[PDB]
Design an enzyme around this catalytic site. Sequence first.
Site, short mmCIF file in Angstrom:
data_model
loop_
_atom_site.label_atom_id
_atom_site.label_comp_id
_atom_site.label_asym_id
_atom_site.label_seq_id
_atom_site.Cartn_x
_atom_site.Cartn_y
_atom_site.Cartn_z
N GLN A 1 -4.69 -1.92 10.43
CA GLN A 1 -3.39 -1.31 10.20
C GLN A 1 -2.72 -1.12 11.55
O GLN A 1 -3.24 -0.43 12.42
CB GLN A 1 -3.55 0.02 9.44
CG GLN A 1 -2.22 0.84 9.21
CD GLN A 1 -2.46 2.19 8.56
OE1 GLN A 1 -3.36 2.97 8.97
NE2 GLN A 1 -1.68 2.49 7.54
N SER B 1 1.84 -0.24 4.97
CA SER B 1 0.50 0.38 4.88
C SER B 1 0.66 1.88 4.61
O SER B 1 0.01 2.74 5.25
CB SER B 1 -0.27 0.10 6.15
OG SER B 1 0.37 0.79 7.22
N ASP C 1 5.32 2.80 7.29
CA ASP C 1 4.69 3.89 6.57
C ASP C 1 4.99 5.24 7.18
O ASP C 1 4.40 6.25 6.73
CB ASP C 1 3.16 3.67 6.55
CG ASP C 1 2.57 3.50 7.95
OD1 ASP C 1 3.34 3.33 8.91
OD2 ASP C 1 1.33 3.56 8.10
N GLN D 1 0.85 -1.19 0.00
CA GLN D 1 0.00 0.00 0.00
C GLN D 1 0.89 1.24 0.00
O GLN D 1 1.92 1.24 0.68
CB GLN D 1 -0.94 0.02 1.24
CG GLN D 1 -1.70 1.38 1.47
CD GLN D 1 -2.29 1.50 2.88
OE1 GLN D 1 -2.01 2.48 3.63
NE2 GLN D 1 -3.08 0.52 3.28
N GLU E 1 -9.44 3.09 6.05
CA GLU E 1 -8.46 2.37 6.86
C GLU E 1 -8.19 3.06 8.18
O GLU E 1 -8.05 2.38 9.20
CB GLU E 1 -7.13 2.21 6.05
CG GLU E 1 -5.87 2.00 6.94
CD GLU E 1 -4.57 1.87 6.15
OE1 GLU E 1 -3.91 2.92 5.82
OE2 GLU E 1 -4.18 0.69 5.94
N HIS F 1 1.23 5.73 0.07
CA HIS F 1 0.73 7.10 0.24
C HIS F 1 0.88 7.85 -1.08
O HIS F 1 1.92 7.75 -1.75
CB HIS F 1 1.54 7.88 1.29
CG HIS F 1 1.44 7.34 2.69
ND1 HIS F 1 2.41 7.60 3.63
CD2 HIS F 1 0.47 6.63 3.32
CE1 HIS F 1 2.07 7.04 4.78
NE2 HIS F 1 0.88 6.45 4.62
N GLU G 1 -3.42 5.61 -0.68
CA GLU G 1 -4.04 6.43 0.36
C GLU G 1 -3.61 7.88 0.19
O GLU G 1 -2.43 8.18 -0.02
CB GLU G 1 -3.60 5.91 1.76
CG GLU G 1 -3.91 6.81 2.94
CD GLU G 1 -3.46 6.23 4.28
OE1 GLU G 1 -2.51 5.36 4.31
OE2 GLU G 1 -4.06 6.65 5.32
#
EC number: 4.2.1.28
Lengths: 136, 136, 551, 550, 176, 177
Positions: free
Chosen positions: D296, D362, D335, D141, D221, D143, D170
């Site tokens: 998460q 994440s 992350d 995943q 999330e 950003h 995200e």
Amino acid sequence: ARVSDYPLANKHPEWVKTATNKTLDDFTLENVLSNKVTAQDMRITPETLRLQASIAKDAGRDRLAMNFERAAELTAVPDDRILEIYNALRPYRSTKEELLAIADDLESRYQAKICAAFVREAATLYVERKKLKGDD
Amino acid sequence: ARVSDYPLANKHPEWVKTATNKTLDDFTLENVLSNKVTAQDMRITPETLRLQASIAKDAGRDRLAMNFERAAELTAVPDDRILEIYNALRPYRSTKEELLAIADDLESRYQAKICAAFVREAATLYVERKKLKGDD
Amino acid sequence: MRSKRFEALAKRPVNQDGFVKEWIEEGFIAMESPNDPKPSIKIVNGAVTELDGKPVSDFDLIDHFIARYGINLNRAEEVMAMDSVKLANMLCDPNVKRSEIVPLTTAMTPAKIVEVVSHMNVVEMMMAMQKMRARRTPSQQAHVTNVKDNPVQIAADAAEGAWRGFDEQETAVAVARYAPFNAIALLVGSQVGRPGVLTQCSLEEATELKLGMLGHTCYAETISVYGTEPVFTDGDDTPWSKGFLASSYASRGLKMRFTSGSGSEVQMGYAEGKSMLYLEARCIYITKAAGVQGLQNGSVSCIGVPSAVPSGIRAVLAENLICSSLDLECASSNDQTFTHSDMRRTARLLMQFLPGTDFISSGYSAVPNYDNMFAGSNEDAEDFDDYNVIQRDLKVDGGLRPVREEDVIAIRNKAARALQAVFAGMGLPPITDEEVEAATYAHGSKDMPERNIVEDIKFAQEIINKNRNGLEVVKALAQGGFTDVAQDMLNIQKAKLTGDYLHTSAIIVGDGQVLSAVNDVNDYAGPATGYRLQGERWEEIKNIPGALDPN
Amino acid sequence: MRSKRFEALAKRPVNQDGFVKEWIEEGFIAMESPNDPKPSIKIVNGAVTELDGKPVSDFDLIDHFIARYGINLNRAEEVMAMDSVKLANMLCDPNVKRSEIVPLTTAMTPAKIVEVVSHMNVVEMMMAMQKMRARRTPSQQAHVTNVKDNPVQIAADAAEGAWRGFDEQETAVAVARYAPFNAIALLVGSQVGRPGVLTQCSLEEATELKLGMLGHTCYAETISVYGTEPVFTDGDDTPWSKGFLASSYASRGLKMRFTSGSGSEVQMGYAEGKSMLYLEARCIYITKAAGVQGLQNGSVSCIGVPSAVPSGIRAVLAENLICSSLDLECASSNDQTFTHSDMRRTARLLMQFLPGTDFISSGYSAVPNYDNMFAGSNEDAEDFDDYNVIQRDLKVDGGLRPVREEDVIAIRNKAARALQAVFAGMGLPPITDEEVEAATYAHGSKDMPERNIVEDIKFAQEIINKNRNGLEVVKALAQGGFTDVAQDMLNIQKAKLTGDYLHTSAIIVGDGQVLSAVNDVNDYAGPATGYRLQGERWEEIKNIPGALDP
Amino acid sequence: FLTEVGEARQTQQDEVIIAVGPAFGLAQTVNIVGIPHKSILREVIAGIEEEGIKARVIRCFKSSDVAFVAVEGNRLSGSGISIGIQSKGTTVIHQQGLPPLSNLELFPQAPLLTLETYRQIGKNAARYAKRESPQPVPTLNDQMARPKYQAKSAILHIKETKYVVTGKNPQELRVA
Amino acid sequence: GFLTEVGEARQGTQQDEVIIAVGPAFGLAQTVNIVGIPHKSILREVIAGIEEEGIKARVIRCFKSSDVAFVAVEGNRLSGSGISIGIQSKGTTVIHQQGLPPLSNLELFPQAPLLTLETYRQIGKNAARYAKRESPQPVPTLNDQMARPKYQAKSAILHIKETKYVVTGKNPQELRV
Ligand code: B12
Ligand code: B12
Ligand SMILES: [Ca+2]
Ligand SMILES: [Ca+2]
Ligand SMILES: [K+]
Ligand SMILES: [K+]
Ligand SMILES: [K+]
Ligand SMILES: [K+]
């Protein structure tokens, strides 16, 4: 000896003598400064190496034990001659006859039967694999 | 439904209808542009969520299945009211009576019995743990 | 028009590294090659007749040595019939004892054990390594060198390395004739920093043995073996010459290991079409066959070769695992530069650091890499604080500890003063008080005054040609006001009399206590068993500098 | 006089990091605190009367929620009696199936499962994680943000991220009123880069749900839970409000997970004297109890707190392992920035990267960290080549791939033009051709022309206040030259009708195929079993730029 | 330099309230990078007043969370606009009617705030009070702010939290 | 082509010469070392260094090994001073001496990418002064910790091709430049 006998320094230091039959305790600063022990005294013995060989076998390390048994035979060989034999085993250094006389020297003069056989084995294979003087 | 029926979109797409009884094949660019289908048409049904709950249970995930059963009840509550109820459960927003009224309204207006019980439970515990209006 | 994203990536250090596509015909492939022989063995009358597809009529010297001395023939046929996947499973299964596995792996052929570990991913290999490691306690080995062969700096850097936790330290020489001075300085400095640290000076083999016979080293490691016959030949040895050398070291009571490592045969031009990992397995079995207790491997100096190709760093971990699984001590490299990237070299280190090996690195540079005479290590002195922080972050004993600047200054100063006294007592070219101070506060040889190299060279070689032995160093320390250090130096020499530290994985800790795989046996059996970082050792590792207190 | 050795060490980036000695009284300790409760449970008439030493009379809302909904009470007494050492051994034993373990862990109390994993070193935890991970295939995943909330740059970076391999992306906002533009840009660019990438926009909870109801996100999330009642309260929720919220998202067909992470209770001032890992296990059980499919965790935004104290990065792996062992999808952090040191952040990442988790990070930053509006990620866009090299070095599938510059340029340009058409068709403040070109070749927002931010947020808020929904975006694409993208956006909306991607670990790969722990069951049983990097995927990972061919 | 003068009261649209946390100007007197609390208030007030709007300072006690500090501020503000400020320096511009955890502008990395930013914050607040639409304060973002200061931020907040008094209404402050 | 072979090399007469011994691929398969320094240039600088110290410079080629140690030992066997300079095709160089183990040396230059023509010249200058039984200040050690990361794979590839020119049993050949 068994693994319970190891380390010899802690369990049985009295089993450890030197080539000239000195004891671990003989090696003090006072004796070093007055040449009561010298470097010639301070060399491991075949008996000590054969004890470690016994301990290695008990630890399940038969190959290490065979290394130590070879080493036991080689304590009798002086430093200069150790280096000569090592060099003579390196590639292209030796004729087969020179290797076989090293083996007879080891056996006849030093009773190094395992090492002598180790050298004869090398000489045989150095012919087939062409690692003798003049094969380069 | 079982895990062997999953994914519904591959194994049983004809089981999937919308809030207004449209099918997956009704959602095309042409039908969107013409407004033949609209955002209101395009919402998951309680039947589909209850199928997924059955699949979750078959997969060993009872709590997930419970969540999906609560969600099935909530498909009938309008977006505005979902947000009002979510905010009313946040700390210091509601009196106890206001939460019990939400619970009654959930059961009586939308037949959302499980969600109603959940809100009543919160109301009870919010008294003891002091999360009602005027406790901050 | 260029993407500025790709411009930014093109500038990253990792894109200066050397990568190559696999080149199978010349062995430029790390593992799992189509040219690698399928495992097999046939035995008649107690003698191998076929080894991994090759009949005995076609054996090279390596095959003969391995077939005659390197495989337990009593169970080789049994183990060859076993499923390689199941064997790999046993390797990482926490409930299959190390003692149950060693009789199996030592009966495998080189191709068979490579087939076994090639079924594993790196997590499985690390899970296995923490069990198969011979010594229960992990340790660490440092390089101590500088580009000027300055003995004053070596003694100081060695004292600091011993103070930080290294249990073995290794020097090497820019100018080979300097080596006696480097060996004495390393030994003196190591004993000042922690009595019992073992020291080696890595040289041409006949030269290194002679240096050991005179007493200026404690052990030897760079006793190289190779995985194909033409490469072994250009290394100036056969399996029999190297086996004889191993027994010669032991006959003088000196600990030793062999060195090998994936990619050597490619680097020297004759890989005979085989993968790096299969040829390295031949090197490991050569070591086993010689009766040598341990092995430095994990590519070592040829790390640029496996790291260039896919799965190369995994293959490096696999060769470490083969070593420990064959019941050899493993000094697991992490000692040589292969990348410009801090991220990449950290990933490469963690493969051994996380599970632990007998020596997590076989040459962490205790000096800045510009002074590293092995052309750079995977870690150097400027990484010390990061290394300690990761130990603390992960609760992993990586063998080292945080230290106080005041203590290190004191111990570096004492090591230089002790060496100064050795040089005065033995009549060597003076070590001046200015140099003692410089060595105390140095980071590296850029901080050292220049020495008269030609005078050092002359007196270093006189040590050899007049056979000046280690007892002269003891006497000089004792007549020079370093009775304490002289006694510690004497105690190191006495360890060569007992044979105790000749055994698998032996180091010397505490008050002269040997700690080897025999009396510190690894007993891993899953969570909460085996070596665990705890107690005062954990308190030591927690105490990193800069930790603020809120009490 | 000063040692130049220590002058050199004092300059090192790692010595700029924040470290602290353990402060037991305030919870500033990562795991294994003497204040953590001894594991215990008592059950009477099918109701818990004692949980980890605490009587039901003294339960806070978190205890009540966990006791009533979070523990399989049929087996809890039996499991509580089991040897925690043997249970830890079972987690990393390759021959104990994940399906034999999940019945035990879901019957444990929070203190019990913490005691189990605290017997493990990180190698054992990684050995266990590759087995307990719910989805057989690991994923990733990203950003996608920038410091200007520039929507053209969001769409281009999102398309690049999807192309590089991220399966979820995200965004977040410097100016919260911008969020509808960020969300639409992210959704459009992600579908351009790879149809099926799921997108989220992380906001205040009521705001984010409303945006999801309008169809401008695919999942959520950052639905936060906390491990003490006072911190939960400052989080503006209770377990019951968050449980209701979870079911509300599902009732709209939207995938969601909760977010927690060790150290949040210390950061927010009320750790109640407990270790970070124990409080985080409470959060994991709150997630399980609510019937939420995933979590998460791994400290996430509070990573500076466990990383300051001993064993904090080990505790981070432990909390990921607890999450997976409780049969939750685990989006395992990696992350957020915690260190100045490349060595240190690599060690932290490898804990999850080496075994694989459902989402190894994440929020890997797919933009340079100066643009990362979560205040920096543990990896960023300038690490992409290192990440690919390590995949190839170790033969580990980290979820990403080498990509060609020409392909990235084309996909970024298409995403920018697609958003240009959305803005034109919806009458939003225009995206000029100059901006499209800038976004195509940009590294980050320093490469982008300035936008009128006041006009952008006026029209972004009109999207919310006039309830302009996701079908308007579909329409603008279908009438503006992007019927392919329009179909892909419509296909995302159609996945919200079927419920398939609501299940544990669901992503959408290939031609609209849902891939979750239901149809991609992790079947790890030791070497040569379970997920293995091989085949075409291995060929993709091996093809890094710069490999000479002899 | 801060003196309570009684309970703050609801007088109208020409004011921005500055709501400071319970330890501001008391047991903590500088923010997380050492900027004095008196210097911060001076610049925020000056930015509000340069815009033709009154500034009124209150101390809040029900929560040490800067959003909840701002929210009690925005309930009492005649314009509905408020500024929340923690002792460690974290700042938010809030507005009546928004959810507690939403806002108009947020400054979530206190180490990056300068006295210039504080002034621009007061200016923007007063312009929101005048129902204007100011260009938001340019976003400050540093990927290393958490590595350097998050542990210290937590420690400072743990200490600020000790001064929370539940149920205690906010107090109006006179500045020296 | 700038090196021609005049015949099998001969045991040197006098005691004031240094033998430069190059590997079999040197100057044909590749005319340049690993970083682009022309081979012809390397001879000229090493040749110049020998003679400016008053000593003769002989050049021979070896064939039995591509390993720069064994090449050099062949040179120190035939050098009337016992001093030789071995040079590999990719640039690796060593100053050798009769009586030394083949893998020992007087000076070694084990990172070919760092050698410059200036360093090559000081090598021949140091080699001659060894022949004069002096102890020169050894050439300053060149060491770059990134040399292996940048070039070790290229060194392996280059050496792999050098080994194709090895001829078992063929004696060294004398060289005119
Ligand atoms: C750490 C962090 C958190 C932590 C700590 C929060 C706390 N009160 O302690 C956690 C994970 C718990 C969290 C929660 C939330 N956060 Co937050 N968070 C961050 C993050 C990643 C880093 C901030 C940091 O470490 N700064 C360095 C330190 C040294 O400076 P500091 O001044 O001490 O930092 C403090 C403030 O950032 C404050 N804070 C953190 N988040 C939020 C959110 C709001 C609304 C407020 C008023 C304050 C606040 O807490 C930090 C420690 O005290 C930022 C990203 C960014 N761009 O800064 C987001 C960020 C600030 N958070 C944000 C949001 C939306 C939230 C939540 C509302 C999310 C939710 N699901 O409810 C909650 C609010 C809970 C609360 N009571 O504050 C948004 C704000 C968006 C906006 N423009 O308003 C950001 C910008 C990220 C995003 N999604 O865009 N957050
Ligand atoms: C890689 C390396 C090796 C490799 C590869 C050697 C090869 N022939 O391919 C291995 C591990 C096999 C090796 C073995 C030995 N090496 Co080595 N090796 C290195 C190392 C670490 C790096 C060199 C490098 O990567 N250069 C970068 C590349 C791009 O440049 P290059 O010019 O192509 O490098 C070549 C030369 O370095 C050559 N080479 C490597 N080692 C040796 C040793 C000698 C005597 C010679 C003539 C050449 C040589 O091999 C490289 C590849 O062709 C150096 C350390 C250093 N400070 O440089 C030691 C080093 C050069 N090696 C050294 C020694 C002593 C040896 C051995 C004799 C050890 C032994 N146990 O027998 C053997 C010699 C074997 C041989 N036939 O050359 C010493 C030389 C000391 C001195 N002052 O003379 C060094 C300096 C390390 C040390 N211990 O001090 N070595
Ligand atoms: Ca070493
Ligand atoms: Ca995330
Ligand atoms: K050696
Ligand atoms: K090898
Ligand atoms: K949220
Ligand atoms: K938490």
